[PDB]
């Protein structure tokens, strides 16, 4: 009994004869690199990737964002070449490189990252954290314009929300300061929602901020359709993700069917869904900014529940499945004396009829 | 058969399961530890288009590690 292979065999392509004339893997690292680059090939047999959780990834995802800025790659490469040549012209830099002392203006390199290549890394971090899965239901977008949000807790120091920072409600007690570059002809909608934290519904979200028709950078002038509410991750719950989305609209759009009462301290009123919001306002705005952070229970959450939501605070607990034991045998042959201990409920003496 | 995901190996080469799940048999590329001298020299004696492709056993876990329940209302 034989069955022919359902496709090319892994080692059939290489020649079997004249194996002296074939170059050998002189090292371990080249074989390693060949093996890893072969591991992702679409093999016709059963493999690790076929079974271990890829959620059927290959399918085009819908891009909802600004088109990339048209650039002249020829002139840009020429300019970069002139810059590296200017760097080459200096010799103190070569001395530093050979003398193993060459630090970098990390501020400058980070700013250059934000201006040029920040959107791509931000988008991949967002998709890794599952923001597109949980907000746009799978659709992706590249945050073109960098956004800067920082929280105020004291007198001097930052507590910014980077691409995946971590802030407690103690540091998020009041609305943060938001900045971004805009022209004085464009209106903007800023939105902040928490992906994790919804008690009654396990797919909804809590709307923490909503500003509409921001006239450029005048964030103090945008109408407050939903006042700011600090985060409130549950006590025993895990760590939640809160995200700021930033959108731009071509024309002034105003809406009262979405507007909340002045206090709006009711979670049923603050039952929010990003996909429904985007479907009902699909045409007017377009996302361009994204930032997010993690939040875990601290002592400010309990007073938030005290006086803001006027509710009794919920606490959670990570439990585990009960341990597995086989069906108990009448004669547990060759089992230790403690076999009978895996099947009791209470470890206290019992006296049945006495 | 070589141990794969959530499959431990005992001192006598026996393969046991590390989680509760479903046994799966695959054929994965074999890359030995650089400490294993015999295997690394066997590797280095191969030409540029050779991979080993040994057989591996994995366990696909069936249940999550746990959940979060409401315990108190205070």
């Amino acid at each position: 009994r034989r069955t022919p292979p359902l496709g090319p065999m892994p080692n059939s392509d290489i020649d079997l004869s004249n194996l002296e004339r074939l170059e050998k893997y002189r090292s371990f690292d080249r074989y390693r690199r060949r093996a890893e680059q072969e591991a992702q090939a679409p093999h016709w047999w059963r493999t690790y990737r076929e079974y271990f959780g890829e959620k059927t990834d290959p399918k085009e995802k819908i891009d909802i964002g600004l088109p990339p800025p048209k650039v002249s790659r020829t002139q840009q490469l020429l300019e970069r070449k002139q810059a590296i040549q200017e760097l080459r012209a200096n010799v103190e830099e070569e001395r530093a490189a050979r003398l193993r002392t060459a630090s970098v203006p990390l501020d400058a390199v980070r700013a250059e990252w934000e201006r040029t290549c920040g959107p791509y890394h931000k988008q991949r971090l967002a998709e890794y954290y599952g923001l597109y899965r949980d907000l746009f239901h799978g659709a992706t977008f590249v945050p073109r314009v960098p956004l800067h949000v920082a929280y105020a807790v004291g007198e001097d120091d930052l507590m910014p929300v980077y691409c995946g920072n971590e802030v407690t409600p103690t540091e998020a007690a009041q609305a943060p300061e938001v900045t971004y570059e805009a022209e004085e002809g464009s209106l903007w909608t800023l939105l902040l929602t928490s992906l994790d934290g919804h008690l009654l519904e396990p797919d909804a979200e809590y709307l923490h901020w909503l500003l509409t028709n921001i006239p450029g950078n005048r964030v103090a002038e945008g109408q407050v359709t939903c006042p700011y509410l600090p985060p409130f991750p549950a006590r025993g719950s895990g760590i939640h993700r809160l995200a700021f989305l930033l959108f731009k609209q071509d024309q002034p759009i105003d809406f009262s069917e979405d507007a909340r009462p002045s206090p709006c301290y009711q979670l049923a009123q603050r039952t929010f869904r990003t996909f429904d919001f985007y479907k009902k306002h699909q045409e007017t705005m377009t996302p361009a900014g994204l930032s997010f952070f993690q939040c875990r229970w601290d002592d400010s959450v309990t007073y938030i529940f005290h006086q803001l939501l006027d509710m009794r605070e919920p606490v959670f607990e990570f439990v585990r499945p009960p341990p597995y034991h086989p069906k108990q045998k009448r004669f547990p042959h060759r089992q230790p004396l403690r076999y009978l201990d895996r099947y009791r409920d209470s470890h206290e003496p019992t006296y049945g009829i006495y | 058969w070589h141990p794969g995901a959530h499959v431990g190996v005992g001192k006598n080469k026996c393969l046991y399961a590390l989680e509760e799940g479903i046994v799966r048999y695959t054929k994965e590329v074999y890359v030995p530890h650089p400490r294993n001298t015999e295997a690394v020299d066997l590797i280095t004696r191969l030409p540029k288009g050779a991979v080993l492709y040994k057989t591996f056993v994995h366990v696909v876990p069936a249940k999550p590690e746990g959940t979060f329940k409401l315990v108190a209302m205070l």
């Binding site: 034989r2 069955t3 022919p4 359902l6 065999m9 080692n11 047999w45 | 054929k27 080993l52 492709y53």
Partner: peptide, 18 residues
């Protein structure tokens, strides 16, 4: 297995003549 299409996938001593 010997009756399967993927039989003989772990064949290497035909590659290493040594």
């Amino acid at each position: 297995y010997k009756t399967k299409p993927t039989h003989g996938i772990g064949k290497y001593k035909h590659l290493i003549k040594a």
